[PDB]
DNA sequence: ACGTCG
DNA sequence: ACGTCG
């Protein structure tokens, strides 16, 4: 849920 | 993830 | 259940 | 020369 590299 | 030159 | 740049 | 999460 975090999106720092993916944002899922 | 680190931004030391890109910051992704 | 998700992976990234100069 | 450096790693970023709910
Ligand atoms: C987002 O909150 C979150 C938490 N755990 C994960 C595990 C695997 C893929 C994506 C996820 N996203
Ligand atoms: C994004 O591509 C990415 C990959 N690995 C991680 C590990 C821990 C926190 C955040 C991350 N983000
Ligand atoms: C950030 O933590 C991080 C780690 N590895 C990477 C590889 C390629 C592009 C960006 C990256 N960012
Ligand atoms: C920033 O543009 C950049 C390019 N190469 C690196 C190599 C190692 C650590 C940090 C770096 N930052
Ligand atoms: K982001
Ligand atoms: Mn991964
Ligand atoms: Mn690394």
Tell me how far apart the alpha carbons of residues B2 and A2 are, in angstroms, rounded to a whole number.
16
In chain A, residues with a C-beta closer than 8 Å to the C-beta of B1 are 4-5
Per residue, what are the HEC states of B1-8? CCCCCCCC
Among B3, B4, B8, residue to substitute to test ligand 4 (most atoms within 8 Å of Cβ): B4
Q: CB of A8 within 8 A of CB of B4?
A: no
Q: End-to-end alpha-carbon separation of chain B, Å?
A: 5
Question: Which atom of ligand 2 has the smallest separation from the CA of A4?
Answer: 12
Resolution (A): 1.5
Experimental method: X-ray
DSSP state of A7: -
Residue with tokens 């992704």: B8
């Amino acid at each position: 849920x975090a999106x720092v590299x993916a944002x899922v």
